[PDB]
């Protein structure tokens, strides 16, 4: 047919992590009446001009190729945006070539930050001192951000600490320089030290359907053997999902029933001390989905009114953005194309140049969906 | 601790398709008390011996590297099988270097098979004759297996046909040699020809949650302009999901409500001819999931009875296979390890050598899941 508007035969696949040096083949698998042309876009910037080549090939990936890719397909009838593809590249930088020094007063917690290093994705970190692998315990913690936390420090904890960082996707590993931790005398004259939260749990947001999410709370106290960290929800202690000496709470398969405030509570068992508390809030993201889509093809007569419906649901409420032939409506500046509050597109007096592909995108923090129609105008 | 049995920190990811020549990095991301050792397996065959290296790296993938990979992790306490990883490699072979000949009698359908070619995944095929791209129409069909079907042949259809095959994953393309189709005179003396099904729909099975599934039915008749192909279910014609001149029925998001028999029906409109019919059956596969798992760690006293529960649901009913320290129970040939019909493992008189990792796999055609426990035996 001479009247087949462009459409995609296959949608691009889920985000995959790619290795430096590997070949990458992107493809624009579209059909339609010909001349059929394709161009590529990276980060809303034009990579290629229009031609009959539907492939975009990177012979050897480097880190600067990481980004969002999409093709546009066009024939005489209109232009259609492919849904975005997320191309991540696994890479591991270097540690800065310098030692660091840190001093803490006996009895306080020492928080040793993982030395600056750029890595995708974030590495797995093993902490060392004098070739001895440091294992989490009731007194030693390693945060979700790979920081080493030594609780209730003593003179024995002084020394030179370092990391082996491993990028699990490309296999590369790096050793950091030293952090020289010194431990000075106790502040004042106090044997026991009340619980104090040194790593507070953060606000957490997770996308619906995710397997797990983990909150973390680390407290200092002395004697550390009496220290108890526990998690409360709705004023009542939680009993399941606890890990790493009670410092990690993992919620599995989180739904909206698990949203809201969580409280971690640190106590010295049997003591007269007040507990230390910190609050964290858990939020669920519902990716967008359409509740009203237009027909694939619509015929209007010149001079009549046209309505193209598009409505989407999600948490948070999705924002809708319209395109005509792969140009956003804001750029076209067409006073006859009215966007309705519910989301639909209203066209007051159809004109022959209104013919083409209208495309609606709904997006929030947790995803993006698309629907489109070919508008045909007669006479 | 000296008593941490091996466990995985991260499960391997979903099946990805890899390109020839690309680097591949597999990783065995397990923790536990050390010495901790790892070995790799490809297609139930041992690739490497046990060592402290948790990575397996293929510098440059070739087709013969395609297969199922998994690591075993072991310390003194026991051995644990990683869940399998499916490594497919995109490849495209060559057509055989020979022309073919085919003769059909005028009015009959000509079924032109795509010339033998090994390819992963199956290529996208465009059929040609004299440089002219052949487009599907009411008289020309291209099956889901890339065969060209010319209905109600005429002398004009004689000529040399060929294909451009494109592997969409690695971008490679091949042109085939020619099929020389000849069209001989009509058989007998008949103007109209009743509908006959030349490509019958097949039994289809699909995994639950799949986006789409498509059935295909192609009929011959003359005059082809009067030919109508339609789909029936429960004795009543289906109205939605039809494609390619009614020859394709796509069921979107198939559930068990769509299982059973579908009928395609070919008629010559307004004619006295009987319809031609073919039946196809659609089946849904439910991947396995557990309905009863054992605790992560279990303590038995010597000489007592132990029960390790494992029960799974799925369509078809999953089969359960047990392992101890990554050795299947059938090999161990231990008369004290009894497998119950519901799935659980029964151990009559616990002995010290029963300590270790017991691992239960449930599988059917649509997936495989695993659960495990560390059995500790005292005294
Ligand atoms: C394309 O856009 C992505 C998304 O913003 C960019 O990713 C950022 O890259 C910079 C480094 O250049 C980092 O500092 C940011 O943290 C990254 N943000 C995210 C969300 O990933 C990417 O660099 C862009 N690529 C190009 C070529 O423009
Ligand atoms: C973490 O999330 C909580 C929960 O929303 C935030 O608390 C809100 O803070 C604003 C800012 O003053 C208040 O006006 C609201 O009353 C709070 N909402 C609720 C439901 O209590 C908090 O600000 C967030 N903090 C960070 C650092 O992200
Ligand atoms: C590993 O097992 C898979 C699964 O059977 C093998 O895949 C088969 O490969 C042969 C060619 O060698 C094909 O003829 C079959 O059709 C394939 N079957 C499937 C289900 O994919 C794979 O070849 C095996 N690889 C090794 C190295 O043993
Ligand atoms: C396609 O599926 C149908 C549906 O199950 C199969 O029909 C069965 O065939 C057996 C073999 O003689 C009969 O005993 C059963 O009565 C049939 N079942 C039903 C529900 O009708 C058919 O054999 C399959 N054919 C192919 C080629 O796969
Ligand atoms: Cs649509
Ligand atoms: Cs378990």
Short mmCIF file of N, CA and C in Angstrom, two decimals, chain A residues 198-304:
data_model
loop_
_atom_site.label_atom_id
_atom_site.label_comp_id
_atom_site.label_asym_id
_atom_site.label_seq_id
_atom_site.Cartn_x
_atom_site.Cartn_y
_atom_site.Cartn_z
N UNK A 198 24.54 7.22 64.53
CA UNK A 198 25.61 7.81 63.74
C UNK A 198 25.37 7.70 62.23
N UNK A 199 24.57 6.75 61.78
CA UNK A 199 24.15 6.66 60.38
C UNK A 199 22.65 6.52 60.41
N UNK A 200 21.99 7.53 60.07
CA UNK A 200 20.54 7.60 60.10
C UNK A 200 19.96 7.01 58.83
N UNK A 201 18.80 6.37 58.93
CA UNK A 201 18.17 5.82 57.73
C UNK A 201 17.63 6.93 56.85
N UNK A 202 17.64 6.69 55.56
CA UNK A 202 17.19 7.69 54.62
C UNK A 202 15.77 7.44 54.14
N UNK A 203 15.13 8.51 53.68
CA UNK A 203 13.92 8.35 52.89
C UNK A 203 14.20 7.41 51.72
N UNK A 204 13.30 6.47 51.49
CA UNK A 204 13.46 5.49 50.42
C UNK A 204 12.23 5.51 49.53
N UNK A 205 12.48 5.49 48.22
CA UNK A 205 11.44 5.33 47.22
C UNK A 205 11.79 4.12 46.36
N UNK A 206 10.79 3.32 46.02
CA UNK A 206 11.02 2.10 45.26
C UNK A 206 9.89 1.93 44.25
N UNK A 207 10.22 1.33 43.12
CA UNK A 207 9.25 1.14 42.05
C UNK A 207 8.44 -0.11 42.33
N UNK A 208 7.13 -0.03 42.08
CA UNK A 208 6.23 -1.16 42.32
C UNK A 208 6.69 -2.41 41.58
N UNK A 209 6.63 -3.55 42.26
CA UNK A 209 7.09 -4.80 41.72
C UNK A 209 8.52 -5.15 42.07
N UNK A 210 9.30 -4.19 42.57
CA UNK A 210 10.69 -4.46 42.94
C UNK A 210 10.77 -5.57 43.99
N UNK A 211 11.83 -6.37 43.89
CA UNK A 211 11.96 -7.54 44.75
C UNK A 211 12.15 -7.14 46.21
N UNK A 212 13.04 -6.18 46.48
CA UNK A 212 13.42 -5.84 47.85
C UNK A 212 13.79 -4.37 47.97
N UNK A 213 13.75 -3.87 49.21
CA UNK A 213 14.30 -2.57 49.56
C UNK A 213 14.80 -2.65 51.00
N UNK A 214 15.91 -1.98 51.29
CA UNK A 214 16.57 -2.13 52.57
C UNK A 214 16.83 -0.77 53.21
N UNK A 215 16.46 -0.64 54.48
CA UNK A 215 16.76 0.51 55.32
C UNK A 215 17.88 0.16 56.29
N UNK A 216 18.66 1.17 56.66
CA UNK A 216 19.86 0.94 57.46
C UNK A 216 19.97 1.95 58.59
N UNK A 217 20.31 1.47 59.77
CA UNK A 217 20.43 2.33 60.93
C UNK A 217 21.57 1.81 61.79
N UNK A 218 22.54 2.66 62.08
CA UNK A 218 23.73 2.27 62.82
C UNK A 218 23.86 3.19 64.03
N UNK A 219 24.05 2.59 65.19
CA UNK A 219 24.14 3.36 66.41
C UNK A 219 25.46 3.08 67.11
N UNK A 220 25.92 4.05 67.88
CA UNK A 220 27.08 3.90 68.74
C UNK A 220 26.61 3.92 70.19
N UNK A 221 27.32 3.16 71.01
CA UNK A 221 27.10 3.10 72.45
C UNK A 221 28.28 2.36 73.04
N UNK A 222 28.45 2.49 74.35
CA UNK A 222 29.47 1.74 75.06
C UNK A 222 28.93 1.36 76.44
N UNK A 223 29.01 0.07 76.81
CA UNK A 223 29.56 -1.10 76.11
C UNK A 223 28.72 -1.60 74.93
N UNK A 224 29.40 -1.84 73.81
CA UNK A 224 28.68 -2.12 72.58
C UNK A 224 27.98 -3.47 72.64
N UNK A 225 28.45 -4.39 73.48
CA UNK A 225 27.81 -5.70 73.60
C UNK A 225 26.38 -5.60 74.11
N UNK A 226 26.05 -4.54 74.86
CA UNK A 226 24.70 -4.33 75.36
C UNK A 226 23.82 -3.56 74.38
N UNK A 227 24.39 -3.09 73.27
CA UNK A 227 23.66 -2.25 72.33
C UNK A 227 22.70 -3.11 71.53
N UNK A 228 21.46 -2.64 71.42
CA UNK A 228 20.42 -3.30 70.65
C UNK A 228 19.80 -2.28 69.70
N UNK A 229 19.76 -2.61 68.42
CA UNK A 229 19.11 -1.78 67.41
C UNK A 229 17.88 -2.53 66.92
N UNK A 230 16.72 -1.87 66.96
CA UNK A 230 15.48 -2.50 66.55
C UNK A 230 14.64 -1.51 65.74
N UNK A 231 13.69 -2.06 65.00
CA UNK A 231 12.88 -1.28 64.07
C UNK A 231 11.42 -1.33 64.50
N UNK A 232 10.77 -0.17 64.46
CA UNK A 232 9.38 -0.04 64.83
C UNK A 232 8.59 0.52 63.66
N UNK A 233 7.34 0.09 63.56
CA UNK A 233 6.38 0.62 62.60
C UNK A 233 5.04 0.74 63.31
N UNK A 234 4.37 1.88 63.12
CA UNK A 234 3.09 2.16 63.80
C UNK A 234 3.21 2.02 65.32
N UNK A 235 4.37 2.42 65.85
CA UNK A 235 4.61 2.40 67.27
C UNK A 235 4.93 1.04 67.86
N UNK A 236 5.06 0.01 67.03
CA UNK A 236 5.26 -1.36 67.49
C UNK A 236 6.48 -1.95 66.81
N UNK A 237 7.28 -2.69 67.58
CA UNK A 237 8.54 -3.26 67.11
C UNK A 237 8.32 -4.29 66.00
N UNK A 238 9.14 -4.20 64.96
CA UNK A 238 9.11 -5.19 63.88
C UNK A 238 10.00 -6.37 64.23
N UNK A 239 9.55 -7.57 63.85
CA UNK A 239 10.21 -8.81 64.22
C UNK A 239 10.86 -9.55 63.05
N UNK A 240 10.39 -9.35 61.82
CA UNK A 240 10.95 -10.05 60.67
C UNK A 240 11.54 -9.06 59.67
N UNK A 241 12.47 -9.56 58.86
CA UNK A 241 13.19 -8.74 57.91
C UNK A 241 14.46 -8.10 58.42
N UNK A 242 14.96 -8.52 59.58
CA UNK A 242 16.12 -7.90 60.20
C UNK A 242 17.40 -8.62 59.81
N UNK A 243 18.46 -7.83 59.61
CA UNK A 243 19.75 -8.32 59.13
C UNK A 243 20.86 -7.51 59.78
N UNK A 244 22.06 -8.06 59.74
CA UNK A 244 23.28 -7.35 60.11
C UNK A 244 23.15 -6.76 61.52
N UNK A 245 22.94 -7.66 62.49
CA UNK A 245 22.84 -7.31 63.91
C UNK A 245 21.70 -6.33 64.16
N UNK A 246 20.62 -6.47 63.40
CA UNK A 246 19.48 -5.59 63.54
C UNK A 246 19.63 -4.24 62.88
N UNK A 247 20.76 -3.96 62.22
CA UNK A 247 20.98 -2.64 61.64
C UNK A 247 20.32 -2.47 60.26
N UNK A 248 19.90 -3.57 59.63
CA UNK A 248 19.26 -3.53 58.32
C UNK A 248 17.88 -4.14 58.39
N UNK A 249 16.90 -3.41 57.88
CA UNK A 249 15.54 -3.90 57.72
C UNK A 249 15.25 -3.97 56.23
N UNK A 250 14.96 -5.17 55.74
CA UNK A 250 14.60 -5.36 54.34
C UNK A 250 13.12 -5.68 54.23
N UNK A 251 12.42 -4.89 53.43
CA UNK A 251 11.02 -5.11 53.11
C UNK A 251 10.99 -5.80 51.75
N UNK A 252 10.43 -6.99 51.70
CA UNK A 252 10.40 -7.77 50.47
C UNK A 252 9.07 -7.57 49.75
N UNK A 253 9.15 -7.39 48.43
CA UNK A 253 7.99 -7.16 47.58
C UNK A 253 7.13 -6.00 48.08
N UNK A 254 7.70 -4.81 48.25
CA UNK A 254 6.96 -3.72 48.89
C UNK A 254 5.76 -3.28 48.04
N UNK A 255 4.62 -3.16 48.69
CA UNK A 255 3.43 -2.57 48.11
C UNK A 255 3.11 -1.28 48.85
N UNK A 256 1.98 -0.67 48.48
CA UNK A 256 1.51 0.51 49.20
C UNK A 256 1.18 0.20 50.65
N UNK A 257 0.97 -1.07 51.00
CA UNK A 257 0.71 -1.42 52.40
C UNK A 257 1.94 -1.20 53.28
N UNK A 258 3.12 -1.10 52.68
CA UNK A 258 4.36 -0.90 53.43
C UNK A 258 4.83 0.54 53.40
N UNK A 259 4.10 1.43 52.76
CA UNK A 259 4.50 2.83 52.72
C UNK A 259 4.39 3.47 54.10
N UNK A 260 5.07 4.60 54.25
CA UNK A 260 4.98 5.42 55.43
C UNK A 260 6.27 5.46 56.23
N UNK A 261 6.10 5.76 57.52
CA UNK A 261 7.23 6.00 58.41
C UNK A 261 7.68 4.72 59.12
N UNK A 262 9.00 4.53 59.16
CA UNK A 262 9.65 3.47 59.93
C UNK A 262 10.59 4.13 60.93
N UNK A 263 10.70 3.53 62.11
CA UNK A 263 11.52 4.06 63.20
C UNK A 263 12.54 2.99 63.58
N UNK A 264 13.81 3.35 63.55
CA UNK A 264 14.81 2.51 64.19
C UNK A 264 15.08 3.07 65.58
N UNK A 265 15.34 2.15 66.51
CA UNK A 265 15.49 2.48 67.93
C UNK A 265 16.70 1.74 68.49
N UNK A 266 17.61 2.48 69.11
CA UNK A 266 18.85 1.95 69.66
C UNK A 266 18.81 2.04 71.18
N UNK A 267 19.00 0.91 71.86
CA UNK A 267 18.95 0.86 73.32
C UNK A 267 20.19 0.17 73.86
N UNK A 268 20.57 0.52 75.09
CA UNK A 268 21.52 -0.27 75.87
C UNK A 268 20.70 -1.11 76.83
N UNK A 269 20.71 -2.43 76.60
CA UNK A 269 19.86 -3.36 77.34
C UNK A 269 20.10 -3.28 78.85
N UNK A 270 19.01 -3.21 79.60
CA UNK A 270 19.07 -3.11 81.05
C UNK A 270 19.53 -1.77 81.60
N UNK A 271 19.77 -0.77 80.76
CA UNK A 271 20.34 0.48 81.25
C UNK A 271 19.26 1.51 81.53
N UNK A 272 19.65 2.54 82.27
CA UNK A 272 18.76 3.67 82.50
C UNK A 272 18.81 4.69 81.38
N UNK A 273 19.54 4.43 80.30
CA UNK A 273 19.66 5.43 79.24
C UNK A 273 18.39 5.53 78.40
N UNK A 274 18.13 6.74 77.88
CA UNK A 274 17.07 6.90 76.90
C UNK A 274 17.49 6.29 75.56
N UNK A 275 16.55 5.67 74.84
CA UNK A 275 16.86 5.21 73.48
C UNK A 275 17.16 6.37 72.54
N UNK A 276 17.93 6.06 71.50
CA UNK A 276 18.11 6.95 70.36
C UNK A 276 17.20 6.50 69.22
N UNK A 277 16.56 7.45 68.53
CA UNK A 277 15.60 7.13 67.48
C UNK A 277 15.85 7.96 66.23
N UNK A 278 15.51 7.37 65.08
CA UNK A 278 15.55 8.04 63.79
C UNK A 278 14.39 7.52 62.94
N UNK A 279 13.80 8.40 62.14
CA UNK A 279 12.67 8.02 61.32
C UNK A 279 13.08 7.99 59.85
N UNK A 280 12.45 7.08 59.11
CA UNK A 280 12.62 6.99 57.66
C UNK A 280 11.26 6.75 57.03
N UNK A 281 11.08 7.25 55.81
CA UNK A 281 9.81 7.15 55.12
C UNK A 281 9.99 6.36 53.83
N UNK A 282 9.09 5.42 53.58
CA UNK A 282 9.14 4.56 52.41
C UNK A 282 8.00 4.95 51.46
N UNK A 283 8.33 5.11 50.18
CA UNK A 283 7.36 5.52 49.16
C UNK A 283 7.38 4.53 48.00
N UNK A 284 6.20 4.28 47.45
CA UNK A 284 6.04 3.38 46.31
C UNK A 284 5.76 4.21 45.07
N UNK A 285 6.46 3.88 43.98
CA UNK A 285 6.26 4.51 42.68
C UNK A 285 5.50 3.53 41.79
N UNK A 286 4.37 3.98 41.24
CA UNK A 286 3.62 3.18 40.28
C UNK A 286 3.92 3.70 38.88
N UNK A 287 4.55 2.91 38.01
CA UNK A 287 4.85 3.41 36.67
C UNK A 287 3.59 3.71 35.91
N UNK A 288 3.65 4.59 34.91
CA UNK A 288 2.44 5.04 34.23
C UNK A 288 1.87 3.96 33.32
N UNK A 289 0.55 3.97 33.20
CA UNK A 289 -0.16 3.13 32.25
C UNK A 289 -1.37 3.90 31.76
N UNK A 290 -1.79 3.60 30.53
CA UNK A 290 -2.88 4.35 29.92
C UNK A 290 -4.23 3.80 30.35
N UNK A 291 -5.17 4.72 30.56
CA UNK A 291 -6.56 4.40 30.85
C UNK A 291 -7.48 4.78 29.70
N UNK A 292 -6.93 5.41 28.67
CA UNK A 292 -7.69 5.77 27.48
C UNK A 292 -6.69 6.05 26.36
N UNK A 293 -6.77 5.27 25.29
CA UNK A 293 -5.91 5.50 24.15
C UNK A 293 -6.75 5.77 22.91
N UNK A 294 -6.21 6.51 21.94
CA UNK A 294 -6.93 6.71 20.68
C UNK A 294 -6.82 5.48 19.79
N UNK A 295 -7.74 5.39 18.83
CA UNK A 295 -7.64 4.38 17.80
C UNK A 295 -6.34 4.56 17.01
N UNK A 296 -5.88 3.47 16.38
CA UNK A 296 -4.62 3.54 15.65
C UNK A 296 -4.70 4.49 14.45
N UNK A 297 -5.87 4.59 13.82
CA UNK A 297 -6.07 5.48 12.68
C UNK A 297 -7.41 6.19 12.85
N UNK A 298 -7.42 7.48 12.54
CA UNK A 298 -8.60 8.31 12.70
C UNK A 298 -8.76 9.16 11.44
N UNK A 299 -9.98 9.26 10.95
CA UNK A 299 -10.27 10.07 9.77
C UNK A 299 -11.14 11.25 10.17
N UNK A 300 -10.66 12.46 9.89
CA UNK A 300 -11.45 13.66 10.07
C UNK A 300 -11.73 14.32 8.73
N UNK A 301 -12.86 15.01 8.66
CA UNK A 301 -13.17 15.84 7.50
C UNK A 301 -12.70 17.26 7.78
N UNK A 302 -12.20 17.93 6.73
CA UNK A 302 -11.76 19.31 6.88
C UNK A 302 -12.86 20.12 7.55
N UNK A 303 -12.46 21.04 8.43
CA UNK A 303 -13.28 22.05 9.09
C UNK A 303 -14.01 21.49 10.31
N UNK A 304 -13.94 20.20 10.59
CA UNK A 304 -14.63 19.69 11.76
C UNK A 304 -13.70 19.64 12.97
#
